[PDB]
Coordinates of C-alpha atoms in Angstrom, one line a residue:
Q1 CA 47.8 -52.4 -10.8
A2 CA 46.1 -55.7 -10.8
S3 CA 42.5 -55.7 -9.7
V4 CA 43.1 -58.6 -7.3
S5 CA 45.8 -58.0 -4.6
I6 CA 47.9 -61.1 -3.9
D7 CA 49.0 -59.5 -0.7
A8 CA 45.3 -59.2 0.5
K9 CA 44.7 -62.8 -0.5
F10 CA 47.9 -64.0 1.3
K11 CA 47.1 -62.1 4.5
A12 CA 43.6 -63.8 4.4
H13 CA 45.5 -67.0 5.1
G14 CA 47.1 -65.7 8.2
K15 CA 50.3 -64.5 6.6
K16 CA 51.8 -61.1 7.4
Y17 CA 52.4 -60.0 3.8
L18 CA 53.3 -60.6 0.2
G19 CA 55.6 -57.7 -0.6
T20 CA 58.2 -56.4 -3.1
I21 CA 61.1 -53.9 -3.3
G22 CA 61.6 -50.2 -4.1
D23 CA 63.7 -47.1 -3.9
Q24 CA 63.4 -43.6 -5.4
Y25 CA 64.0 -44.5 -9.0
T26 CA 61.5 -47.4 -9.4
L27 CA 59.0 -45.6 -7.2
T28 CA 59.1 -42.6 -9.6
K29 CA 60.1 -43.9 -13.0
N30 CA 56.4 -44.2 -14.1
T31 CA 52.8 -44.2 -12.8
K32 CA 52.1 -48.0 -12.8
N33 CA 55.0 -49.1 -10.6
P34 CA 54.1 -47.2 -7.5
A35 CA 50.4 -47.9 -8.2
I36 CA 51.1 -51.6 -8.4
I37 CA 53.1 -51.5 -5.1
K38 CA 50.3 -49.6 -3.4
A39 CA 47.5 -51.9 -4.7
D40 CA 49.0 -55.4 -4.8
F41 CA 51.8 -55.6 -2.2
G42 CA 51.8 -55.1 1.6
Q43 CA 55.5 -54.8 2.4
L44 CA 58.7 -53.1 1.0
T45 CA 62.4 -53.8 1.2
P46 CA 64.8 -51.1 0.0
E47 CA 66.6 -52.4 -3.0
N48 CA 69.9 -50.7 -2.2
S49 CA 69.4 -47.5 -0.1
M50 CA 69.9 -49.1 3.3
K51 CA 73.1 -51.1 2.5
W52 CA 76.4 -50.1 4.2
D53 CA 77.8 -48.4 1.1
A54 CA 74.7 -46.3 0.7
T55 CA 74.3 -45.3 4.3
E56 CA 77.9 -44.8 5.8
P57 CA 80.2 -44.2 2.7
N58 CA 82.8 -42.7 5.1
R59 CA 83.5 -43.6 8.7
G60 CA 80.9 -41.9 10.9
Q61 CA 79.4 -39.9 8.0
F62 CA 75.9 -41.1 7.2
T63 CA 73.8 -40.5 4.1
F64 CA 70.2 -41.3 4.6
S65 CA 68.5 -39.5 1.7
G66 CA 67.6 -42.7 -0.3
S67 CA 66.6 -44.8 2.8
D68 CA 64.5 -41.9 4.2
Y69 CA 62.5 -41.8 0.9
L70 CA 61.8 -45.6 0.9
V71 CA 60.8 -45.6 4.6
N72 CA 58.6 -42.5 4.1
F73 CA 56.9 -44.0 1.1
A74 CA 56.2 -47.3 2.9
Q75 CA 55.0 -45.6 6.1
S76 CA 52.8 -43.2 4.1
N77 CA 51.1 -46.1 2.3
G78 CA 50.7 -48.6 5.0
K79 CA 53.5 -50.9 3.9
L80 CA 55.5 -53.0 6.3
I81 CA 59.3 -52.5 6.0
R82 CA 62.1 -55.0 6.0
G83 CA 65.4 -53.1 6.7
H84 CA 68.1 -54.5 4.5
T85 CA 70.9 -54.9 5.3
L86 CA 73.2 -54.1 8.3
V87 CA 76.2 -56.5 8.1
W88 CA 77.3 -57.8 4.7
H89 CA 80.6 -58.5 2.9
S90 CA 79.2 -57.1 -0.4
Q91 CA 78.4 -53.4 -1.1
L92 CA 80.6 -52.6 1.9
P93 CA 82.8 -49.5 1.8
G94 CA 86.6 -50.0 1.5
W95 CA 87.2 -48.2 4.8
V96 CA 85.4 -51.0 6.6
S97 CA 87.2 -53.8 4.8
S98 CA 90.7 -52.5 5.6
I99 CA 90.2 -52.4 9.4
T100 CA 92.5 -55.0 11.0
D101 CA 92.0 -54.2 14.7
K102 CA 89.2 -56.3 16.3
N103 CA 88.1 -53.7 18.9
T104 CA 88.1 -51.0 16.1
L105 CA 85.9 -53.1 13.8
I106 CA 83.5 -53.9 16.7
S107 CA 83.2 -50.2 17.5
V108 CA 82.5 -49.5 13.8
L109 CA 80.1 -52.4 13.5
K110 CA 78.1 -51.3 16.6
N111 CA 78.0 -47.7 15.5
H112 CA 76.8 -48.6 12.1
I113 CA 74.0 -50.9 13.4
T114 CA 73.0 -48.3 16.1
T115 CA 72.8 -45.2 13.9
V116 CA 71.0 -46.9 11.0
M117 CA 68.5 -48.8 13.3
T118 CA 68.0 -45.8 15.6
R119 CA 67.0 -43.6 12.7
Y120 CA 64.0 -45.9 11.8
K121 CA 63.4 -47.2 15.3
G122 CA 59.8 -48.5 15.6
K123 CA 59.1 -48.3 11.9
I124 CA 60.8 -51.6 10.9
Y125 CA 59.1 -54.9 10.9
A126 CA 62.2 -56.9 10.4
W127 CA 65.9 -56.3 9.9
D128 CA 68.3 -58.4 7.9
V129 CA 71.0 -58.0 10.5
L130 CA 73.4 -60.4 8.9
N131 CA 73.4 -61.2 5.1
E132 CA 75.1 -64.1 3.3
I133 CA 77.6 -65.1 6.0
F134 CA 77.9 -68.7 4.8
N135 CA 80.0 -70.5 2.2
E136 CA 78.1 -73.0 0.0
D137 CA 79.4 -75.8 2.1
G138 CA 77.8 -74.4 5.3
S139 CA 81.0 -73.1 6.9
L140 CA 81.3 -69.4 7.8
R141 CA 82.4 -67.0 5.1
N142 CA 85.7 -65.4 5.6
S143 CA 84.5 -61.8 5.4
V144 CA 86.4 -59.0 7.1
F145 CA 83.9 -59.4 10.0
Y146 CA 84.7 -63.1 10.4
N147 CA 88.5 -62.7 9.8
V148 CA 88.9 -59.8 12.2
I149 CA 86.3 -60.3 15.0
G150 CA 85.8 -64.1 14.7
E151 CA 82.5 -65.9 15.1
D152 CA 81.6 -63.5 18.0
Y153 CA 80.5 -60.9 15.5
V154 CA 77.3 -62.9 15.1
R155 CA 76.5 -62.4 18.8
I156 CA 77.6 -58.8 18.8
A157 CA 75.5 -57.8 15.8
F158 CA 72.3 -59.4 17.0
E159 CA 72.6 -58.2 20.6
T160 CA 73.3 -54.7 19.5
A161 CA 70.3 -54.8 17.1
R162 CA 68.0 -56.2 19.9
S163 CA 69.1 -53.4 22.3
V164 CA 68.6 -50.6 19.8
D165 CA 65.1 -51.6 18.5
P166 CA 63.3 -54.4 20.4
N167 CA 60.3 -53.9 18.2
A168 CA 62.0 -55.3 15.1
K169 CA 62.3 -59.0 14.1
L170 CA 66.0 -59.8 13.8
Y171 CA 66.9 -62.0 10.8
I172 CA 69.9 -63.8 9.3
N173 CA 69.5 -63.8 5.5
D174 CA 71.1 -66.0 2.8
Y175 CA 70.7 -67.4 -0.7
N176 CA 70.8 -71.0 -2.0
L177 CA 68.7 -72.4 1.0
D178 CA 66.4 -73.8 -1.7
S179 CA 66.3 -77.5 -1.2
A180 CA 66.3 -79.7 1.9
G181 CA 69.6 -81.4 2.4
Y182 CA 71.7 -78.8 0.6
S183 CA 75.0 -78.2 2.5
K184 CA 74.3 -74.5 3.0
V185 CA 70.8 -75.3 4.4
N186 CA 72.4 -77.9 6.8
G187 CA 75.0 -75.2 7.8
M188 CA 72.4 -72.6 8.4
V189 CA 70.4 -74.9 10.6
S190 CA 73.3 -76.2 12.7
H191 CA 74.8 -72.8 13.3
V192 CA 71.5 -71.1 14.2
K193 CA 70.7 -74.0 16.6
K194 CA 74.0 -73.3 18.4
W195 CA 73.5 -69.5 18.4
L196 CA 70.0 -69.7 19.8
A197 CA 71.1 -72.2 22.5
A198 CA 73.8 -69.6 23.4
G199 CA 71.1 -67.0 23.8
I200 CA 71.8 -65.0 20.6
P201 CA 68.6 -63.0 19.7
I202 CA 67.9 -64.5 16.2
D203 CA 64.1 -64.1 15.5
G204 CA 64.1 -65.3 11.9
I205 CA 65.9 -66.9 9.0
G206 CA 65.4 -65.3 5.6
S207 CA 65.8 -67.4 2.4
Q208 CA 66.4 -65.2 -0.6
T209 CA 65.1 -67.8 -3.1
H210 CA 66.6 -66.6 -6.4
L211 CA 65.6 -69.5 -8.5
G212 CA 66.1 -71.0 -11.9
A213 CA 63.2 -72.4 -13.9
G214 CA 61.7 -75.6 -12.4
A215 CA 63.2 -75.1 -8.9
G216 CA 60.0 -74.0 -7.3
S217 CA 58.8 -77.5 -6.2
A218 CA 61.9 -78.0 -3.9
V219 CA 61.3 -74.9 -1.8
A220 CA 58.6 -76.4 0.5
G221 CA 61.2 -79.0 1.7
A222 CA 63.8 -76.3 2.2
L223 CA 61.5 -74.2 4.4
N224 CA 60.6 -77.3 6.4
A225 CA 64.3 -78.0 6.9
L226 CA 65.0 -74.4 8.0
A227 CA 62.1 -74.7 10.5
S228 CA 64.3 -77.1 12.5
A229 CA 66.8 -74.3 13.3
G230 CA 64.4 -73.2 16.0
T231 CA 63.8 -69.6 15.2
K232 CA 60.3 -68.2 15.8
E233 CA 59.8 -67.4 12.1
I234 CA 61.3 -67.6 8.6
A235 CA 60.5 -65.7 5.4
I236 CA 61.2 -65.8 1.7
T237 CA 63.0 -62.5 1.3
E238 CA 64.1 -62.0 -2.4
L239 CA 62.0 -64.2 -4.6
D240 CA 62.4 -64.3 -8.4
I241 CA 62.3 -67.2 -10.8
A242 CA 63.9 -67.3 -14.2
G243 CA 61.0 -67.7 -16.7
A244 CA 58.3 -66.8 -14.0
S245 CA 56.2 -69.8 -14.8
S246 CA 52.9 -70.1 -12.9
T247 CA 53.9 -73.6 -11.7
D248 CA 57.2 -72.3 -10.1
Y249 CA 55.5 -69.3 -8.5
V250 CA 52.5 -71.2 -7.2
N251 CA 54.8 -73.9 -5.8
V252 CA 56.9 -71.3 -4.0
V253 CA 53.7 -69.5 -2.6
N254 CA 52.4 -72.8 -1.4
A255 CA 55.8 -73.6 0.2
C256 CA 55.3 -70.5 2.4
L257 CA 51.5 -71.0 2.8
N258 CA 51.9 -74.6 4.2
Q259 CA 54.7 -73.8 6.6
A260 CA 53.6 -72.3 9.9
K261 CA 56.8 -70.4 10.5
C262 CA 56.8 -68.6 7.1
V263 CA 55.4 -65.1 7.8
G264 CA 55.6 -63.9 4.2
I265 CA 57.2 -63.5 0.8
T266 CA 59.0 -60.5 -0.7
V267 CA 59.4 -60.7 -4.5
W268 CA 62.6 -59.0 -5.6
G269 CA 61.1 -56.4 -7.9
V270 CA 57.7 -55.6 -9.4
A271 CA 58.2 -55.6 -13.2
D272 CA 60.8 -57.4 -15.4
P273 CA 62.7 -54.4 -16.8
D274 CA 63.6 -53.4 -13.3
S275 CA 65.0 -56.8 -12.3
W276 CA 68.7 -57.4 -11.6
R277 CA 68.3 -60.3 -14.0
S278 CA 65.9 -58.6 -16.4
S279 CA 66.9 -60.9 -19.3
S280 CA 65.4 -63.9 -17.5
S281 CA 62.0 -62.2 -17.0
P282 CA 61.8 -63.5 -13.4
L283 CA 59.1 -61.2 -12.0
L284 CA 55.3 -61.0 -11.7
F285 CA 54.7 -57.9 -14.0
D286 CA 56.0 -57.6 -17.5
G287 CA 57.7 -54.9 -19.6
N288 CA 54.4 -52.9 -19.7
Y289 CA 54.0 -53.2 -16.0
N290 CA 51.0 -55.5 -16.5
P291 CA 50.3 -58.7 -14.6
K292 CA 51.8 -61.9 -16.0
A293 CA 50.1 -65.3 -15.9
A294 CA 52.0 -66.2 -12.7
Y295 CA 50.5 -63.3 -10.9
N296 CA 47.0 -64.4 -11.7
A297 CA 47.9 -68.0 -10.9
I298 CA 49.1 -67.0 -7.4
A299 CA 45.9 -65.1 -6.9
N300 CA 43.8 -68.1 -7.9
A301 CA 45.8 -70.4 -5.6
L302 CA 44.9 -68.2 -2.6

């Protein structure tokens, strides 16, 4: 644990949180990891436990052991929770992908959203209702949901989520929304504008922000561009930067800090060895679970 909590410092600027991720393994693999989470971060996103493959492996058969643990740990330690994720083409069970009947897929989709959301009703700050639904060019990804149901799946998912838990902020999440003017950013903005105009309950846009070294300085503009979609809020949801330079990290923190709609930042992991791209040392804590230069830099910028 770092003496100075970047979450505390970020919240002091009117932000809701500066969080990270977790699940049973990383929360129990050693003493430092859960200690760091408790001391320096104010929000948690389940790394894999709430995804479709991990929650409904078989049609109508739910497995909530992992997700229960993450939610219980967060709730037991005053951490906000971002449910992740309800509808996604990746980490989706084969039984869902093979459905060809529209009404059947809608029934399945609504049951999945309802059961998962109902179980944690009232305990979730935000839900990534839809994840990665756009192609790089800004058009809609031809996932089973889009292919079988059509664009109406967007409305269906958000409306179902809203009716199940009106206390949660409903988000549409995606990656590569990292520079103003990028085709995917333009596509995200145009579609959300249309959906909001149609009355679809989209409260926020989540920008994953999985960056390479030197890409931190372009994020401010990306968030500004995303602000034009018209959602009440936006958030950096899965931050990690190859190399973890102080310049990159501080640029990204400032990007959120100076944008009124940005409620917070979730860093995708605590320490480097637990990163999905561990070889690029993209996190704030190192192999010994000790604060890296970037962590202290973020603290000093707040």
